[PDB]
Amino acid sequence: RKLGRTSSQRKAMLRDITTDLIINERIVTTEARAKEVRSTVEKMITLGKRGDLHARRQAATFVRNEVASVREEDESIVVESALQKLFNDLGPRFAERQGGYTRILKTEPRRGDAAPMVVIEFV
Amino acid sequence: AVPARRTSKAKKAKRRTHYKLTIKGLNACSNCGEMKKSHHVCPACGHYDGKDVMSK
Amino acid sequence: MKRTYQPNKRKRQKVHGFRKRMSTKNGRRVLASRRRKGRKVISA
Amino acid sequence: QITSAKATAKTVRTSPRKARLVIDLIRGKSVADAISILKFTPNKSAGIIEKVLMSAVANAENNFDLDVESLVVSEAFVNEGPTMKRFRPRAKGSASPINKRTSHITVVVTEK
RNA sequence: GUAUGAGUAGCGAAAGACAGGUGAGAAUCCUGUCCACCGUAUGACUAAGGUUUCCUGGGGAAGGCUCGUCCGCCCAGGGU
RNA sequence: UAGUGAACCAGUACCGUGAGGGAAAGGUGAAAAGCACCCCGGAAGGGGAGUGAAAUAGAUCCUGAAACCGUGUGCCUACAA
RNA sequence: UUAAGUGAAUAAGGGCGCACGGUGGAUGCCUUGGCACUAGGAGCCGAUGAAGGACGGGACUAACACCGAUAUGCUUUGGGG
């Protein structure tokens, strides 16, 4: 286990960060945030393969409720809502890929408070 | 309690022997030979053995 | 907590105002004694 | 010609304790070692001593010498600049002295 | 005027995260999203009190218990 | 630090509602002739080139002692109260 | 080659000396200012509005100084060039 803050604030933080790596797939943060988001997204990709009504109804916990990502239409506004993006991409990106879906980099310390920094991307 | 005297001129240095600054783990690039950190992205090259890592 | 030096505009002009060091003969000591010091601010 | 250009930094708004640490790690090394070590520091001296060395290199070029890559930082200094004195209210109504300091910093660059 | 203790104590109650901007440089500046705290009150109006801090446009040595491209700070104009 | 408190825009700034308490702070050069232009850096700060008899006389500016803090070197030091 | 013995030097740091730098203005020297007096002048101003001030008067206006809607000044007589 790891500790950064109080009890419920960790669940707050991990709902906060991890809607990116659903939208951007690039995040610039520190050591410990990177390793916790490793474990959580290593979980929450695998529940994007099933498509069960348990998968729709456990994705509504570690994903913020309605987060838009709209760059598409035909004549519409189609809202890839960061859970439909799960169940329409991440299964059909990781159809045969086994565990270990992400990569962590080691770039730089921080100008302000000496925070060593990390890029996270998937593939 | 209270410092009984001033610390004499010897003990300033004799404390501060173990107050050094150290920088370690610096190695040449795979692309420009600049002495950069092991296990770290080059800020100028941006490579892990021939990869356009910091690139769009 | 209450503390002391509290402001008004009537009180600090009808205690330390100009008239109420003219209406007696112990502010007239204070007037000439300050004019024999060179200090500008006489009173309010 | 003559070798050994110099350049001085004046009124550097830090201490000498936090600067003499850094110039433990320069004296005895070349220019290519110098900027390499100074790029990877988590300190305030990074913005300072780098520009001091860059001015030392430009004074070695534009005025005196050639052979930029064969230059050695021979000596350097951090010296105690004029202080600045302000106060802070400590508790129970009384005062307490708290310094602010500066420094004067020079770096000597010989050829070899 | 200068040390000493000593880069020790402390940095004066409280949840933030990402992306994108201008810029020499950003955890602190701006913009966008989500989350959170109070709600007979951290919401609204006024009488004293304060005496221009208000607005517009720039700067970063000082001030700001960190930085600071920002300010109730400074410079110049303009408002009752 | 003498000499009025006060040689300087002082009974002022500043403390006290009050009556009243009241400070430190003179000196470039003989003449600003107060460093055009080049270069680093956002700047400050600097290095050349110039002024000037002299700049370690560069506007915190005449000579510049102590305490304090740096640099490098001749000799000594890990069985010692 | 064995065996018994004798054993020098290298410093993370430090001491003593020399030499060079910074932060500080003690002292050298100087005065535009003070202190005590000499010798004379002079020893009141004021309902014909005083002693003191408030406010304002310049091309540029924050202060000092001079002045007062005739306002950084009006008129006359002598010195002056």
Ligand SMILES: [Zn+2]
């Ligand atoms: Zn490289």
